[PDB]
């Protein structure tokens, strides 16, 4: 199917506790493959998946040098944004940035992304045309003016149509045995009595990759969206993910409920009932 590569930057100030920390992590789909942390004893971009370890020295040097330069650019940028919002020197603040590309089954570019947030709120985003900007407020308009004046969008476009797509294709080939393998969920339904009057049906999905999945309960064939307790998809620690959906049912009506599971790794959608 389709694939994505994303880099995630977090820059966090901490007045009175040293200089702002800069963290960067890289993903292909739901698989982290690199990290950088300016707090490390000796900061460098470092491997986090086996298929990246084979890249040579000039790869790691380039990715380390850019990250150290970014450490300083984001420190200056935090100072600028504190100015733009008239903020005190004494408070802690966060810039986040999220950029990358999507490619289709033929490796063709589907679309590019570059969005920034400030203290967890949308700040500025590159538009899908990879040529214009959307600023969330008058402070972000100051950043937009700087970036237009400096022709930033063209630099981002060149990266997103070029290196981003080419390196993603390279990674997908080098890590094909895992990046191009969908693991279907192992599923089952548990039954937790609450009272003589009702019980909980819980539909489980374990060991699946990638994280995207849909679990839904139906009663007499009708989706129970409002009534379904969905837990947030969670990592198992071994690259796989877990999720469950629960519904409270009248005792004796358990067999009118079915759980439905769609996942990329599944030959076809699954339909499960409680099997006592």
């Amino acid at each position: 199917g389709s694939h994505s590569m994303r880099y995630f930057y977090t820059a966090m100030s901490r007045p009175g506790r040293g200089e702002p920390r800069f963290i960067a992590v890289g993903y292909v789909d739901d698989t982290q493959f690199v990290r950088f942390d300016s707090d490390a004893a000796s900061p460098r971009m470092a491997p986090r998946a086996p298929w990246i370890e084979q890249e040579g020295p000039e790869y790691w040097d380039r990715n380390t040098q850019i990250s150290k330069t970014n450490t300083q650019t984001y420190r200056e940028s935090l100072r600028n944004l504190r100015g733009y919002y008239n903020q005190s020197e004494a408070g802690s603040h966060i810039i986040q940035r999220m950029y990358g590309c999507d490619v289709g089954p033929d490796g063709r570019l589907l679309r590019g992304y570059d969005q920034s947030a400030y203290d967890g709120k949308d700040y500025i985003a590159l538009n899908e045309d990879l040529s214009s900007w959307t600023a969330a407020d008058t402070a972000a308009q100051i950043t937009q003016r700087k970036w237009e004046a400096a022709r930033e969008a063209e630099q981002l476009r060149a990266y997103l149509e070029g290196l981003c797509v080419e390196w993603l294709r390279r990674y997908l080939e080098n890590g094909k045995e895992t990046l191009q393998r969908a693991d279907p969920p192992k599923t089952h339904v548990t039954h937790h009595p609450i009272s003589d009057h009702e019980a909980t049906l819980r539909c489980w999905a374990l060991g699946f990759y990638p994280a995207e999945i849909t679990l839904t309960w139906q009663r007499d064939g009708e989706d129970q969206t409002q009534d379904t307790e969905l837990v947030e998809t969670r990592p198992a620690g071994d690259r796989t993910f877990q999720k469950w959906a629960a519904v409270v049912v009248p005792s004796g009506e358990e067999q009118r409920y079915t759980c439905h599971v769609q996942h990329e790794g599944l030959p076809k959608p699954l339909t499960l009932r409680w099997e006592p």
């Binding site: 880099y7 960067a24 890289g26 971009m45 790869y59 380039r62 990715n63 850019i66 990250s67 330069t69 970014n70 650019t73 984001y74 200056e76 940028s77 600028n80 944004l81 810039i95 950029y99 920034s116 500025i124 950043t143 700087k146 970036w147 400096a150 930033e152 630099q155 981002l156 990266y159 290196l163 981003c164 390196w167």
Partner: peptide, 9 residues
């Protein structure tokens, strides 16, 4: 691989 370091905000 990372994008080249760009302009400050």
């Amino acid at each position: 691989t990372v994008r080249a370091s760009g302009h400050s905000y």
